[PDB]
């Protein structure tokens with residue numbers, strides 16, 4: 001049951017290939033295009049692609065949200 | 073007018089009126105003139121914006137909105 005979710009995460013990184021600037025290579029800009037997103041600058045851009053653009057993770061196991069369509 | 077030249081390759085400069093040494097152009101207007109022609113000064117020396125820095129003028133623009 002859970003090893004089919006790891007393969008679900010693996011083929012998400014396979015679909016986000018086939019582009020020369022990889023999506024985990026640089027930080028996005030926020031609203032005014034003057035600085036980076038705040039948690040992409042304190043952390044790493046790769047560490048930002050996992051927790052916010054793949055998982056959209058929460059701060060606890062008690063706080064849960066919606067189904068997160070792409071992952072589905 | 074160039075001052076304080078070093079081996080690392082650094083100096084200070086300010087700009088005066090063409091034949092009036094008492095009339096120093098203000099620094100906030102020299103910063104706007106350099107921003108308008110920074111890509112043209114970079115090409116004249118084969119440097120690219122990180123090997124020719126101005127210490128108080130930082131590059132700003134450019135959205136990376138790639139995919140349609």
Ligand SMILES: *[C@@H]1O[C@H](CO)[C@@H](O[C@@H]2O[C@H](CO)[C@@H](O)[C@H](O)[C@H]2NC(C)=O)[C@H](O)[C@H]1NC(C)=O
Nearest residue numbers: 087088089090091092093094095096097098099
């Ligand atoms: C050279 O530039 C100076 C500015 O630094 C001019 O001085 C001004 O002169 C007018 C009248 O002569 C005064 O009302 C201003 O107050 C002066 N400016 C300052 C900052 O004191 C000077 O006139 C210029 N010389 C020439 C020949 O153009």
Ligand SMILES: *[C@@H]1O[C@H](CO)[C@@H](O)[C@H](O)[C@H]1NC(C)=O
Nearest residue numbers: 029030031032033034035132
């Ligand atoms: C950053 O963007 C906000 C709007 O999202 C704007 O109000 C603010 O002035 C911008 N900051 C700068 C320094 O441009």
Ligand SMILES: *[C@@H]1O[C@H](CO)[C@@H](O)[C@H](O)[C@H]1NC(C)=O
Nearest residue numbers: 052055056057058059065068
């Ligand atoms: C998940 O992403 C959506 C937008 O895709 C955002 O509105 C929401 O705040 C995110 N969830 C959390 C817990 O930040």
